[PDB]
Amino acid sequence: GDRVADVIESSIGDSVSRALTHALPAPTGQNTQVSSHRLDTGKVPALQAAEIGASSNASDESMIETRCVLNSHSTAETTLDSFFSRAGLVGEIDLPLKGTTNPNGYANWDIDITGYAQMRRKVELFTYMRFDAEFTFVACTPTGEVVPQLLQYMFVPPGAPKPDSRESLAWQTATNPSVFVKLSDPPAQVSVPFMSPASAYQWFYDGYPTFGEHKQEKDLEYGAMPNNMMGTFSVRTVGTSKSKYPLVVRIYMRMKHVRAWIPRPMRNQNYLFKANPNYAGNSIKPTGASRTAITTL
Amino acid sequence: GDRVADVIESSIGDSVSRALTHALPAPTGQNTQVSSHRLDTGKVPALQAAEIGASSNASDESMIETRCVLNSHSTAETTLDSFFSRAGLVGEIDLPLKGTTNPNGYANWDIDITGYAQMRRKVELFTYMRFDAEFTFVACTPTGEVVPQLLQYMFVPPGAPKPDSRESLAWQTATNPSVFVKLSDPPAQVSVPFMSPASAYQWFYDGYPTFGEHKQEKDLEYGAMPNNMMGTFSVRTVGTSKSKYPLVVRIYMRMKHVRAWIPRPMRNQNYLFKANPNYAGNSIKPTGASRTAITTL
Amino acid sequence: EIGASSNASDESMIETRCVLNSHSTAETTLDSFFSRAGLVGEIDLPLKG
Amino acid sequence: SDRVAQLTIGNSTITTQEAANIIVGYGEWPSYCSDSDATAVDKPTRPDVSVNRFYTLDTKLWEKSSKGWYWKFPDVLTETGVFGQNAQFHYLYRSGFCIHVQCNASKFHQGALLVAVLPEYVIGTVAGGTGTEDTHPPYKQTQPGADGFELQHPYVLDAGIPISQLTVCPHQWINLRTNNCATIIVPYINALPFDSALNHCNFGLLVVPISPLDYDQGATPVIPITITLAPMCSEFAGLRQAVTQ
Amino acid sequence: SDRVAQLTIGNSTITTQEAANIIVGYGEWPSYCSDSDATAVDKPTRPDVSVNRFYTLDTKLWEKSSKGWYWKFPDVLTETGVFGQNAQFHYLYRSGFCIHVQCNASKFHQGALLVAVLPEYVIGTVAGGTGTEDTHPPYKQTQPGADGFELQHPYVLDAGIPISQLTVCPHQWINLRTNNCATIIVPYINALPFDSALNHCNFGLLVVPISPLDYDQGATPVIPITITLAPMCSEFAGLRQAVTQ
Amino acid sequence: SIWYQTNYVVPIGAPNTAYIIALAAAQKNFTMKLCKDASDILQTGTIQ
Amino acid sequence: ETILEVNNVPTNATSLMERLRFPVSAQAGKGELCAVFRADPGRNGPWQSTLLGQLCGYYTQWSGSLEVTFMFTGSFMATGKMLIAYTPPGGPLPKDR
Ligand SMILES: Nc1ncnc2c1ncn2[C@@H]1O[C@H](COP(=O)(O)O)[C@@H](O)[C@H]1O
Ligand SMILES: Nc1ncnc2c1ncn2[C@@H]1O[C@H](COP(=O)(O)O)[C@@H](O)[C@H]1O
Ligand SMILES: CCCCCCCCCCCCC/C=C\[C@H](O)[C@H](N)CO
Ligand SMILES: CCCCCCCCCCCCC/C=C\[C@H](O)[C@H](N)CO
Ligand SMILES: [Cl-]
Ligand SMILES: [K+]
Ligand SMILES: [K+]
Ligand SMILES: [K+]
Ligand code: NA
Ligand code: NA
């Protein structure tokens, strides 16, 4: 029981997030209302105070004499699902015959979509994102040819044994999900749920994954978010003997059922490395085009 | 406002001191009830478990066959006011003529009643005590003679100027309380209220009055409780010339309207110093009489 | 020694807060655990063998 | 009546007579974690006044050539007062913040600072200049503590993103002819209900001059920028011994 | 059903299968300070679980010749955990305590410890032996910290009072043939509503063998006495920088 | 971590060393998700 | 509940059964350390001996509270008090009690 007044009257524990704003339906662009001349003292829409941190509240109607316009222009194409639910390339896997990289007929790809700039720049507009996804696998030879070859794709979550050869016992796939498909078949396609241990994936994590001294050698771990590490994607030609053909698997991802939070400035310098915002210090370029003088076009 | 459950259901702030016991009226000693023989299993009043920390609950009635006795013996003389409201000596002040101590005709006595063992031992039975008091001042020459001499007693609270001579300006006593009385008059007597800044006086204070390092030189301050320091009692012969007679003022204190808390073991070693429990290590004596053998009287 | 597992819970061993647990138990059903195709046999049909 | 303000929390009070309103990040006030969002089962500790109060941590000097600085939260406070102690003894922490950046001059000085809060402010390096070396920033640059850290390339926020768009984050400006402070309230932002105050900085505070400081010879040349902040609705859990990192 | 017990507070739990009930000092449970008894005006901080929990501070070895020891409260805890930090950062403190002294042996060992709580346990010195020197005990003897201090003259409790009457204070006995622990709950005792955790020890805990430890050659000879205690209803006020004394 | 709070005490005639057996399990709020293959595969060559 | 091999040190076939139990014995009263182990149920170590640990291996993620019940198998005449502690993340192996 509580008896001293400061305890009774305290707000310690209020779990309700007091919100100053709320969403309104806006299926179309706003309309324009008729306006006329205003010759007044006291009323001054045009004057603002940007220091406050808010954007100007002045509208067309108050700055010029406007007509009435019934705007039926839709806002549907700018929803998160509209912007993001379009398949883009997020991974390429090579399976050569005579090669330096994967001459053994299998390959392991750590799932990380930050290797391609188009897709990456788009998702990095937000800090946190939660979504489901549709993955499509397009396979062919390096010339774009289709050959009668059978492949196995397996999803290996963190902790499951990664295959170490085309004949690894792990390909028994008694629990992991695998897809068996021919290059001659249409691209394989599957749905993936939101799998992070967190409520969202986060393209930016200002911190370290572990405790301890963060000495120079363990600085490559700054920014590493295990909550974003979903595992490995493994592929192999299905046989006990080497395949007769060199292959390429291109991975496309289409997000769906998207939610995003905390928008941020968009990347303006070329990307250099996966999941790390390093930029070339000697080649810092302006965000856009430049001109010779401010008084000339 | 509070919304998370642990906050709603918490007892943080309960100001009510849950008490397991309560006082009952007991104006007389308890009576004795008739009892008879009990030849039973399971019932065992005589057996106790002192380890628990409680005193035995066994009574006469359950240990022997008793008669009925209507006890009208009163408990009134053992109340705190009965025990303490009896005037005892707490201070002696000398005002000699030709002397080493106070040859100047005035004297300052820091109010501390721990200089006399009878009174001291009684109040030290408790840790905290709150009370009002009646002070009586008995003055005479060293032979017990009464002379036609006028005195001034002044109460000087902490912060008021202590007189430094029989002619100090402080004797103007425009605000402090003073008593002017002749030795030929009956003893002066006044009532004093409870004056501590605390809710009670405390005969024991396990601590230091100030912060800082408590180095050897400031160890004489261990146990010093300013909350018990009520000031100075000053006395002077009222004149500009030395008095013709040597005097002694004995101070008696009678407590009244007493409240006490936390009883403690009673002093069993001789006292040595005022407000400090030091005892002579080489002369530690038993609490009481001793005998030659445990099997002999 | 009785043969049963401990009946002690978080609530009785430490001061706990209230937690509304909506974590699902669906993926640990027998059909969830077992209804996943795995390899159980390989048969060879060679030419010169 | 919008230019004047008083912020009182704990045993601390701030006053300003040249304010520009108050920004509440993403439109929401700090709040404690609900029983449905929570996952850890131990009863949290909510110290209240001993930790939710204003702490003045640092003063920088604004010079005609300053590039700008940043601080990381809750890093700036992990070693200060009762808040710090709690952050060290507990695995889990969560809180909001009221940030008040101060800077006054005279009606004859000029310049404008952009004060903004950027969640998950991951720092990048210049990659060996040529961009061929995959280097990483050192602990002292990612978690600079109370001293903060000076931006090497403000135009790209030392992270390859345009400062020109930083206004998409909760912010205010300190434009000397107008105001002498910025006040931003920030709720707890993260994809988890609680996290480590040591391993993870939820957001960074940036103070960057966009219109350079200027004044005539003879006017006071020392123009300090002081950072004061207060945790709000602090909660801690997962108690053990104190740890600094 | 009086011999068995579990004490759970904070993130800590104690069990015993050879208890002897529980003593609640002076018949009353610890409580927070009321708005009428209080005098300081600042809103207090009541950390709760982070400080009201069991802390195991020390272990002494009971030997056939031990004289007994004492600890001072809250001194024993001023440098431990979140409680200590709070005690150092605040001028004012107040709390109750649950004390659990542990000591087990075998059905073949014997001895009895008196475990008692004495408020305002002022220590005296032997006055130079002859009683002519007005000496005072050093800081390390008055506030011994977690290590406690050994009694020089247990019969007079190093203070000129009889240990034979110490049972007038809240206490229990650990009589080996009967129990292996003592549990005493103590409310806040003082003539003020709050006080300094550093300058004033509200009470002392005494553990003194009255019936000496004994056993036959061959039985385990190392018989430890461990002290575990938990603050209850802790409240702090008057916040400033941390101070150790 | 497990520590001696007091001491293991025994009288004359009883062993100076004894053992503790630890039994572990999950509480009722325990659940698992994202079904995967175990880290071990208990076969070396083909099973005949 | 299944048996947790806190004593996962002996490896020779003839001593495998010793992994199933660990000892306590008379000490010096210095609050000595008896044993330590990580609480991670799906990590290599003691938990691998438990059915929980094994089942855990078929799932990528888990959530929940765990419990370890310790049974003392000394003689009836043996007594003792042990302090068992759980140190949440970030706290290094405790150096002392
Ligand atoms: N930010 C916006 N974008 C597009 N349409 C809007 C927006 N705000 C309001 N509207 C439209 O204007 C109407 C509300 O006008 P009002 O009540 O003045 O806010 C609604 O029926 C909406 O369809
Ligand atoms: N501790 C005591 N000392 C003296 N008289 C007592 C005491 N307790 C109870 N009594 C008397 O006995 C009566 C109560 O008996 P009972 O109801 O059995 O507690 C009252 O009328 C009291 O006058
Ligand atoms: C049968 C094959 C199925 C293939 C399974 C694909 C699972 C992919 C899950 C989507 C994960 C989203 C991307 C997450 C994190 C980022 O790529 C980086 N780690 C950021 O550091
Ligand atoms: C006109 C003369 C009036 C005389 C005034 C007498 C005031 C005496 C107040 C009673 C104080 C009670 C005793 C208090 C403390 C103890 O003596 C010691 N300081 C304990 O350390
Ligand atoms: Cl694990
Ligand atoms: K419209
Ligand atoms: K009677
Ligand atoms: K549920
Ligand atoms: Na306007
Ligand atoms: Na009885």
Automatic annotation (TrEMBL), chain C:
Coiled-coil regions listed: none
Domain of life per record: Viruses
Subcellular location(s) of the protein: Host cytoplasmic vesicle membrane; Host nucleus; Virion
Family note: Belongs to the picornaviruses polyprotein family.
Role of this protein: Capsid protein VP0: Component of immature procapsids, which is cleaved into capsid proteins VP4 and VP2 after maturation. Allows the capsid to remain inactive before the maturation step. Capsid protein VP4: Lies on the inner surface of the capsid shell. After binding to the host receptor, the capsid undergoes conformational changes. Capsid protein VP4 is released, Capsid protein VP1 N-terminus is externalized, and together, they shape a pore in the host membrane through which the viral genome is translocated into the host cell cytoplasm.
Assembly and oligomerization: Capsid protein VP1: Interacts with capsid protein VP0, and capsid protein VP3 to form heterotrimeric protomers. Five protomers subsequently associate to form pentamers which serve as building blocks for the capsid. Interacts with capsid protein VP2, capsid protein VP3 and capsid protein VP4 following cleavage of capsid protein VP0.
Name used for this protein in its record: Genome polyprotein
Residues of the full protein shown: 616 to 664 of 2193
